[PDB]
């Protein structure tokens, strides 16, 4: 089912009192669907909207999530609900374990009767102090809570260090048949992130090219070999949940990189979701509702 997706980034994963540059709109889902995408990933920073007692998600904000999820699902889109930018659990995971479990208890109970096309992604890009031994422990507990009401909804988990390929070997695959494993790919970092302010240490890079040389193509293929081999041994489908290039990158390289990465994902039966619809990595004009044909052609022929 899942194949061609796109992230609505820098939107609902913003901090609670500083919204970012993309305002979620139902028209997005109409244009996402009409462009040929079958999946939409929705980052949501639920952690910024909780009772800080039972960790009750702000009902007003939760009704907003109902708004967009319902609309997207009603357009026959696969919706990945993604717990994004849970920052404090990365700093002090043991202090925020319970808040993490209760957050997902509410999501699982509130959407238990929703269409199969709604997918749960537990925790985007674990990092810092939420290392694998703790990450695995929390994922197992969260999956057992969700399964009490959603025995069969697809659940997406990812490895430590920003969903990094190199940490798949530490990810414990749950003994659950409805679980997708996700990695993110932005290699090389300096090319993909160049000029983006939301990327610490990459805002001042300039004019870095990706020409698809033989060693550049060999590198990309070798990295995807690692994920496929790991996926083959553990019997799990792989979701390239994030990949993309900033708008500041040279046009030709940006298109070639996105084309090559998308092609590698499909060649190995990876589902994928382009990183970002209308922001600094965007390929879509939120004001006009028009697509960047150059990059869109790289994703969907
Ligand atoms: Ca990084």
Residue numbers in the entry: 39 to 90, 92 to 340
What's in the article?
Our subsequent analysis of the cognate glycosyl hydrolase, CcsZ, reveals the Clostridial cellulose synthase contains a functionally analogous, but structurally distinct, glycosyl hydrolase from the known Gram-negative cognate glycosyl hydrolase BcsZ. In agreement with typical GH-5 enzymes, CcsZ folds into an overall structure adopting a distorted TIM barrel fold, in which an (α/β)8 barrel is formed at the core of the fold by eight parallel β-strands. The GH-5 consensus catalytic acid/base and nucleophile residues are present in CcsZ as Glu-164 and Glu-281, respectively.
We engineered and synthesized the soluble domain of ccsZ from C. difficile, corresponding to residues 30–340 of the GenPept entry WP_077724661.1, into the pET21 expression vector to generate a recombinant His-tagged expression construct of CcsZ. Model building and subsequent refinement resulted in an improved Rwork and Rfree of 0.227 and 0.260, respectively. Interestingly, we observed this groove to be strongly negatively charged in CcsZ, which is not a typical feature of GH-5. Our structure of apo-CcsZ superimposed excellently on apo-TmCel5A, with a root mean square deviation (r.m.s.d.) of 0.677 Å across 252 equivalent Cα atoms, as expected given the reasonably high sequence identity (43%) between these proteins and the highly conserved GH-5 fold. The TmCel5A-cellotetraose complex also superimposed well over CcsZ, with an r.m.s.d. of 0.620 Å over 242 equivalent Cα atoms. A comparison of the substrate-binding cleft, informed by the positioning of the cellotetraose ligand of TmCel5A, demonstrated a clear difference between the subsite architectures of the two enzymes.
